[PDB]
Tab-separated table of C-alpha atoms in Angstrom:
chain	number	residue	atom	x	y	z
V	734	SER	CA	9.604	-0.096	-10.568
V	735	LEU	CA	10.983	2.081	-7.760
V	736	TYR	CA	11.688	4.867	-10.274
V	737	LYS	CA	8.036	5.677	-10.925
V	738	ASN	CA	6.175	8.799	-9.848
V	739	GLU	CA	2.852	7.446	-11.054
V	740	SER	CA	4.071	5.212	-13.876
V	741	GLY	CA	6.828	7.562	-14.996
V	742	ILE	CA	7.020	9.899	-17.983
V	743	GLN	CA	9.492	9.067	-20.741
V	744	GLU	CA	11.346	12.223	-21.660
V	745	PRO	CA	13.203	11.188	-24.822
V	746	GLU	CA	16.123	13.549	-24.197
V	747	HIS	CA	18.028	11.490	-21.639
V	748	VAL	CA	21.707	10.546	-21.787
V	749	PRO	CA	22.971	7.950	-19.308
V	750	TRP	CA	26.738	7.651	-19.063
V	751	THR	CA	26.503	4.087	-20.383
V	752	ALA	CA	24.458	5.535	-23.263
V	753	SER	CA	27.253	7.969	-24.134
V	754	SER	CA	28.628	7.629	-27.662
V	755	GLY	CA	31.815	8.656	-29.405
V	756	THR	CA	35.431	7.563	-29.409
V	757	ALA	CA	35.387	7.313	-25.620
V	758	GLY	CA	31.674	6.594	-25.887
V	759	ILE	CA	30.548	3.015	-25.408
V	760	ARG	CA	29.856	2.532	-29.112
V	761	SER	CA	33.389	2.993	-30.438
V	762	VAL	CA	34.754	0.988	-27.508
V	763	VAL	CA	32.480	-1.974	-28.222
V	764	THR	CA	33.222	-1.735	-31.947
V	765	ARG	CA	36.963	-1.928	-31.274
V	766	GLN	CA	36.443	-4.799	-28.840
V	767	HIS	CA	34.411	-6.606	-31.490
V	768	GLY	CA	37.293	-6.130	-33.912
V	769	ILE	CA	39.864	-7.369	-31.400
V	770	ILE	CA	37.786	-10.453	-30.591
V	771	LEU	CA	37.591	-11.142	-34.310
V	772	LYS	CA	41.350	-10.704	-34.756
V	773	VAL	CA	41.969	-13.133	-31.893
V	774	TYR	CA	39.413	-15.607	-33.230
V	775	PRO	CA	41.447	-17.260	-36.050
V	776	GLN	CA	44.403	-17.608	-33.697
V	777	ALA	CA	42.167	-18.743	-30.825
V	778	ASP	CA	41.469	-22.402	-30.122
V	779	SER	CA	38.006	-23.886	-30.574
V	780	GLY	CA	36.792	-23.468	-26.993
V	781	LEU	CA	38.517	-20.095	-26.845
V	782	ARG	CA	36.577	-19.065	-29.955
V	783	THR	CA	33.384	-20.408	-28.397
V	784	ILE	CA	33.802	-18.273	-25.282
V	785	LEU	CA	34.614	-15.357	-27.600
V	786	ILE	CA	31.385	-15.735	-29.543
V	787	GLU	CA	29.125	-16.044	-26.490
V	788	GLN	CA	30.780	-13.055	-24.803
V	789	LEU	CA	30.569	-10.871	-27.909
V	790	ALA	CA	26.981	-11.964	-28.557
V	791	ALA	CA	25.920	-10.981	-25.038
V	792	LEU	CA	27.656	-7.611	-25.382
V	793	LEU	CA	25.921	-6.866	-28.684
V	794	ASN	CA	22.634	-8.015	-27.150
V	795	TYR	CA	22.998	-5.430	-24.403
V	796	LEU	CA	23.994	-2.675	-26.839
V	797	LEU	CA	20.986	-3.396	-29.052
V	798	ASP	CA	18.804	-3.319	-25.938
V	799	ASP	CA	20.256	0.136	-25.259
V	800	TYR	CA	19.427	1.398	-28.750
V	801	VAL	CA	15.923	-0.101	-28.713
V	802	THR	CA	15.112	1.468	-25.345
V	803	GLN	CA	16.431	4.778	-26.683
V	804	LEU	CA	14.128	4.473	-29.697
V	805	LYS	CA	11.111	3.606	-27.541
V	806	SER	CA	11.875	6.610	-25.333
V	807	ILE	CA	12.021	8.924	-28.368
V	808	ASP	CA	8.772	10.528	-29.520
V	809	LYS	CA	7.970	11.833	-32.979
V	810	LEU	CA	5.067	14.318	-32.690
V	811	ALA	CA	7.596	17.077	-33.268
V	812	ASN	CA	10.797	15.083	-32.832
V	813	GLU	CA	10.350	12.485	-35.544
V	814	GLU	CA	13.637	13.717	-36.983
V	815	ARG	CA	15.623	12.916	-33.857
T	490	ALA	CA	9.475	10.033	19.248
T	491	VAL	CA	10.311	12.720	16.657
T	492	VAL	CA	13.822	13.999	15.937
T	493	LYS	CA	14.638	16.721	13.413
T	494	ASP	CA	18.166	17.128	12.034
T	495	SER	CA	20.102	19.939	10.349
T	496	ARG	CA	23.357	20.163	8.400
T	497	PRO	CA	25.862	22.982	7.680
T	498	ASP	CA	24.412	25.992	5.848
T	499	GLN	CA	26.437	27.403	2.956
T	500	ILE	CA	23.763	28.902	0.636
T	501	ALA	CA	19.983	29.245	0.944
T	502	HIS	CA	19.604	26.490	-1.657
T	503	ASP	CA	22.484	24.657	0.010
T	504	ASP	CA	20.767	25.136	3.376
T	505	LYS	CA	17.452	23.674	2.249
T	506	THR	CA	19.428	20.881	0.554
T	507	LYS	CA	21.355	20.160	3.761
T	508	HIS	CA	18.106	20.208	5.735
T	509	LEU	CA	16.724	17.583	3.341
T	510	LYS	CA	19.941	15.567	3.699
T	511	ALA	CA	19.550	15.872	7.472
T	512	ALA	CA	16.006	14.545	7.188
T	513	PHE	CA	17.721	11.705	5.349
T	514	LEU	CA	20.079	11.473	8.335
T	515	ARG	CA	17.082	11.093	10.642
T	516	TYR	CA	15.713	8.428	8.303
T	517	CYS	CA	19.035	6.577	8.537
T	518	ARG	CA	18.975	6.856	12.333
T	519	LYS	CA	15.520	5.193	12.265
T	520	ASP	CA	13.200	8.192	12.564
T	521	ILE	CA	10.336	8.265	10.065
T	522	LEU	CA	8.332	10.845	12.019
T	523	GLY	CA	11.100	13.438	12.287
T	524	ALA	CA	12.055	13.086	8.627
T	525	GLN	CA	8.393	13.369	7.611
T	526	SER	CA	7.918	16.455	9.790
T	527	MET	CA	10.991	18.112	8.270
T	528	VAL	CA	9.837	17.221	4.752
T	529	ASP	CA	6.442	18.762	5.517
T	530	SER	CA	8.206	21.860	6.860
T	531	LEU	CA	10.493	22.187	3.818
T	532	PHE	CA	7.847	21.279	1.211
T	533	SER	CA	4.098	21.918	1.186
T	534	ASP	CA	1.484	22.246	-1.532
T	535	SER	CA	0.736	25.825	-2.575
T	536	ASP	CA	-0.387	24.950	-6.139
T	537	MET	CA	1.540	22.149	-7.870
T	538	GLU	CA	3.222	22.848	-11.204
T	539	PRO	CA	6.787	21.939	-12.235
T	540	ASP	CA	9.789	23.877	-10.934
T	541	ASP	CA	13.490	23.183	-11.371
T	542	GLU	CA	14.625	23.649	-7.777
T	543	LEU	CA	13.404	20.482	-6.001
T	544	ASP	CA	14.959	18.388	-8.759
T	545	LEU	CA	18.086	20.555	-8.520
T	546	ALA	CA	18.436	19.896	-4.785
T	547	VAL	CA	17.890	16.136	-5.052
T	548	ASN	CA	20.287	16.004	-8.017
T	549	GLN	CA	22.998	17.908	-6.156
T	550	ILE	CA	22.543	15.528	-3.218
T	551	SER	CA	23.099	12.606	-5.597
T	552	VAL	CA	26.032	14.276	-7.390
T	553	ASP	CA	27.752	14.948	-4.068
T	554	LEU	CA	27.190	11.378	-2.847
T	555	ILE	CA	28.637	9.977	-6.080
T	556	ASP	CA	31.513	12.445	-6.637
T	557	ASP	CA	32.586	12.288	-2.991
T	558	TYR	CA	36.308	11.831	-2.403
T	559	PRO	CA	36.653	10.759	1.244
T	560	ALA	CA	37.890	13.470	3.607
T	561	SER	CA	35.747	13.069	6.722
T	562	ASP	CA	37.548	10.896	9.269
T	563	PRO	CA	41.361	11.151	9.411
T	564	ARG	CA	41.887	8.165	7.120
T	565	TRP	CA	39.594	9.961	4.666
T	566	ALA	CA	41.233	13.329	5.125
T	567	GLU	CA	44.071	10.936	4.268
T	568	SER	CA	42.054	9.304	1.529
T	569	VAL	CA	42.847	12.743	0.234
T	570	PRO	CA	46.431	11.603	-0.424
T	571	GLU	CA	48.911	11.786	2.405
T	572	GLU	CA	48.469	8.110	3.239
T	573	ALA	CA	49.623	6.813	6.596
T	574	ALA	CA	46.073	5.659	7.220
T	575	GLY	CA	44.824	6.757	3.803
T	576	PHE	CA	44.005	4.536	0.851
T	577	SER	CA	47.036	2.264	0.473
T	578	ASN	CA	45.998	-0.671	-1.743
T	579	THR	CA	43.285	-2.284	0.358
T	580	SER	CA	40.256	-4.057	-1.114
T	581	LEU	CA	37.833	-4.962	1.683
T	582	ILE	CA	37.834	-1.511	3.304
T	583	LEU	CA	37.066	0.358	0.094
T	584	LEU	CA	34.481	-2.312	-0.677
T	585	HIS	CA	32.917	-1.387	2.654
T	586	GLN	CA	32.927	2.295	1.710
T	587	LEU	CA	31.230	1.389	-1.569
T	588	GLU	CA	28.755	-0.683	0.446
T	589	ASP	CA	28.006	2.267	2.722
T	590	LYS	CA	27.559	4.628	-0.224
T	591	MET	CA	25.180	2.106	-1.782
T	592	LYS	CA	23.430	2.078	1.586
T	593	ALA	CA	23.244	5.873	1.446
T	594	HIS	CA	21.779	6.026	-2.057
T	595	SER	CA	19.275	3.248	-1.317
T	596	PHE	CA	18.191	4.850	1.952
T	597	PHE	CA	17.890	8.202	0.182
T	598	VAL	CA	15.543	6.773	-2.433
T	599	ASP	CA	13.566	5.040	0.331
T	600	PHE	CA	13.478	8.237	2.402
T	601	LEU	CA	12.195	10.262	-0.545
T	602	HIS	CA	9.580	7.589	-1.281
T	603	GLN	CA	8.340	7.443	2.316
T	604	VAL	CA	8.114	11.234	2.557
T	605	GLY	CA	6.280	11.437	-0.770
T	606	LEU	CA	8.361	13.959	-2.726
T	607	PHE	CA	8.881	11.342	-5.452
T	608	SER	CA	5.599	12.211	-7.181
T	609	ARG	CA	6.610	15.878	-6.859
T	610	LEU	CA	9.947	15.193	-8.550
T	611	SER	CA	10.180	16.340	-12.154
T	612	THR	CA	12.527	16.890	-15.096
T	613	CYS	CA	15.468	19.199	-14.464
T	614	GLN	CA	18.120	20.842	-16.585
T	615	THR	CA	21.491	19.168	-16.052
T	616	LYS	CA	24.675	20.234	-17.876
T	617	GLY	CA	22.126	21.797	-20.227
T	618	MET	CA	20.138	18.548	-20.481
T	619	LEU	CA	16.645	17.944	-19.105
T	620	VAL	CA	16.738	14.672	-17.164
T	621	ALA	CA	14.266	12.636	-15.130
T	622	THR	CA	15.246	12.560	-11.460
T	623	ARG	CA	14.474	8.871	-10.943
T	624	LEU	CA	16.459	7.814	-14.010
T	625	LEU	CA	19.276	10.072	-12.799
T	626	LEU	CA	19.261	8.132	-9.531
T	627	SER	CA	19.327	4.935	-11.592
T	628	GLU	CA	22.384	6.153	-13.514
T	629	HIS	CA	24.282	7.240	-10.407
T	630	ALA	CA	23.525	3.991	-8.591
T	631	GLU	CA	24.650	2.067	-11.679
T	632	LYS	CA	27.945	3.973	-11.576
T	633	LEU	CA	28.271	2.991	-7.915
T	634	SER	CA	27.453	-0.611	-8.857
T	635	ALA	CA	30.215	-0.482	-11.468
T	636	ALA	CA	32.647	0.692	-8.788
T	637	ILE	CA	31.515	-2.172	-6.540
T	638	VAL	CA	31.978	-4.624	-9.417
T	639	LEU	CA	35.520	-3.441	-10.111
T	640	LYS	CA	36.205	-3.808	-6.397
T	641	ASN	CA	34.869	-7.365	-6.558
T	642	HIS	CA	37.104	-8.173	-9.513
T	643	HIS	CA	40.041	-6.781	-7.558
T	644	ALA	CA	39.078	-9.000	-4.619
T	645	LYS	CA	38.880	-11.976	-6.985
T	646	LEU	CA	42.079	-11.513	-9.042
T	647	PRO	CA	44.053	-8.781	-7.279
T	648	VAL	CA	47.392	-8.897	-9.102
T	649	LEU	CA	45.612	-9.223	-12.432
T	650	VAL	CA	42.943	-6.598	-11.763
T	651	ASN	CA	45.189	-4.245	-9.791
T	652	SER	CA	47.908	-4.405	-12.458
J	1060	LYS	CA	54.839	-7.966	20.555
J	1061	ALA	CA	52.921	-10.380	18.315
J	1062	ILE	CA	52.403	-7.669	15.695
J	1063	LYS	CA	56.112	-6.787	15.871
J	1064	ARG	CA	57.062	-10.184	14.378
J	1065	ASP	CA	55.120	-9.257	11.233
J	1066	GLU	CA	56.826	-7.786	8.180
J	1067	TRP	CA	55.917	-4.497	6.505
J	1068	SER	CA	56.623	-2.681	3.280
J	1069	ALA	CA	58.235	0.101	5.274
J	1070	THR	CA	58.191	3.814	4.429
J	1071	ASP	CA	55.034	3.532	2.278
J	1072	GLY	CA	53.768	0.076	1.384
J	1073	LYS	CA	52.769	-1.663	-1.816
J	1074	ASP	CA	50.473	-4.387	-0.472
J	1075	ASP	CA	46.991	-5.012	0.895
J	1076	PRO	CA	46.837	-4.669	4.686
J	1077	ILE	CA	44.156	-7.348	4.733
J	1078	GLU	CA	45.684	-10.036	2.531
J	1079	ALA	CA	49.332	-9.259	3.281
J	1080	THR	CA	49.072	-9.887	7.033
J	1081	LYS	CA	47.617	-13.393	6.633
J	1082	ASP	CA	51.120	-14.861	6.334
J	1083	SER	CA	51.994	-12.895	9.484
J	1084	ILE	CA	51.717	-14.548	12.882
J	1085	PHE	CA	49.336	-12.039	14.475
J	1086	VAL	CA	46.518	-12.697	12.014
J	1087	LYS	CA	46.952	-16.407	12.743
J	1088	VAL	CA	46.508	-15.476	16.398
J	1089	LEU	CA	43.249	-13.830	15.335
J	1090	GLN	CA	41.921	-16.965	13.630
J	1091	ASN	CA	42.948	-19.046	16.644
J	1092	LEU	CA	41.017	-16.649	18.875
J	1093	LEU	CA	37.996	-16.920	16.587
J	1094	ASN	CA	38.194	-20.725	16.604
J	1095	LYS	CA	38.371	-20.735	20.401
J	1096	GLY	CA	35.372	-18.382	20.295
J	1097	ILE	CA	36.879	-14.960	21.013
J	1098	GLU	CA	35.233	-12.004	19.269
J	1099	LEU	CA	37.911	-9.776	17.738
J	1100	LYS	CA	35.640	-6.715	17.783
J	1101	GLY	CA	35.360	-6.817	21.573
J	1102	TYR	CA	38.658	-8.346	22.648
J	1103	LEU	CA	40.950	-6.581	20.164
J	1104	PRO	CA	41.413	-2.979	21.375
J	1105	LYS	CA	39.757	-0.165	19.453
J	1106	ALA	CA	41.956	1.976	17.215
J	1107	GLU	CA	41.885	4.645	19.925
J	1108	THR	CA	43.709	2.408	22.408
J	1109	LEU	CA	45.756	0.888	19.588
J	1110	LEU	CA	47.276	4.262	18.773
J	1111	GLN	CA	47.493	4.875	22.508
J	1112	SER	CA	49.796	1.842	22.722
J	1113	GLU	CA	53.439	2.913	22.450
J	1114	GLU	CA	54.754	-0.381	21.062
J	1115	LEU	CA	52.184	0.164	18.306
J	1116	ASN	CA	53.262	3.796	17.936
J	1117	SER	CA	57.005	3.074	17.683
J	1118	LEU	CA	56.840	1.598	14.154
J	1119	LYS	CA	54.438	4.162	12.641
J	1120	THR	CA	57.416	5.463	10.660
J	1121	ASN	CA	56.021	3.040	8.097
J	1122	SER	CA	52.828	4.759	7.013
J	1123	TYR	CA	51.693	1.389	5.667
J	1124	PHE	CA	52.366	-0.208	9.052
J	1125	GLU	CA	49.870	1.863	11.018
J	1126	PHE	CA	47.505	2.090	8.068
J	1127	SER	CA	47.420	-1.699	7.899
J	1128	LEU	CA	46.948	-1.923	11.632
J	1129	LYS	CA	43.843	0.207	11.254
J	1130	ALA	CA	42.510	-1.468	8.115
J	1131	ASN	CA	42.873	-5.053	9.302
J	1132	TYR	CA	41.653	-4.399	12.838
J	1133	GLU	CA	38.561	-2.568	11.619
J	1134	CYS	CA	37.882	-5.145	8.905
J	1135	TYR	CA	38.007	-8.188	11.148
J	1136	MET	CA	36.387	-6.329	14.049
J	1137	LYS	CA	33.441	-5.614	11.772
J	1138	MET	CA	33.397	-9.196	10.505
J	1139	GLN	CA	32.987	-10.038	14.188
J	1140	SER	CA	30.187	-7.506	14.728
C-alpha cells in the first residue's frame, strides 16, 4: 500500500533477491530442503513427521505464491513468450 | 521554523543525492518544512516525463543504507575489524543498529512520501535491469528484516544460531 | 573496583558482552540499582568518563574488556532511557 505512486505500475521485468533462481537461487535450495525433509521423514517419529509436513507445506505455499505473483506481473502483449 | 541540511559533496550527482539525504536528515530531526523546501529546491516541474536520474539517486541512497559496513563512530571504524570496541560477538547492540537502519529506511520512505517525489519516481535500470523504485525499497527493507530476524534467532538460541 | 571482580576472555574475547557479564557481580549491582529505582543511564557514567577512569583504562589490554564495558553500559543505559 505504501509502495504506490497512484496505484503502481507492474513492470514484469523485476527480480527480487528472494525471487532469484539457480543453484544458489531459492528454487534449488528449497528443492534440496524438500528432499532432505523427505529423507528424514521415514526415520522421523510421528510428531516429527507432522512438524515436517506442516513446515514443508508452508514453504511450498510461499514459493507458489512467488511464482503466481511473478506470472500476474508478466504481460503478454509482446512478452507472451516470457 | 525551517532548517535546511547539506551533506558532503563528492560528485554533482553525489551532491544532489547528499542534499536529498540531508533533507532526510532534517526530516529525522523533526523538520517537515525544511525538508520540503529543500525538495522543492532540488526538484521542480519543468515538464514531467520519465528520466533515470531521480530513481538512480534514490536507489543509490537505498543501496548505501543497505550495504553499509559501520565505520562512523570509533566502534564502527572498529566495526571495520580491529575490534577493541568493534563487533565482538554481541547481539543486542547489533540488533539496535539493525533497528536504527530500519528506522532510517522507514523514515526515508515517509520523507519521500511527505515531500511528494513518490509519484515522480519511476522505473530505473539497475545492474542492467529496469526496476520499480518502490518495489526496490520493499526488497531492501526485506533484506534488512531478514538480518533482524537472524539477529532475533541469535538472541533466542545463541550457541545454536551462532555456531 | 566492582567491575574488576568480573572475568574476561582476555586478549580478544569469545563471548557476548551483554549476556556474559550477567554472572559477574557488577551487572548484579546494576539490577539492584534498578530495583531500588536508580536509572543506569543517568547514574552510570557516560563512556567518555568511563574511558577517562584509569581503573577502567588499566585492563583495556583485553580488547573484549573495554568493548564489553562499552556495549553493556550503552545497552542498559538505553534500556533505562
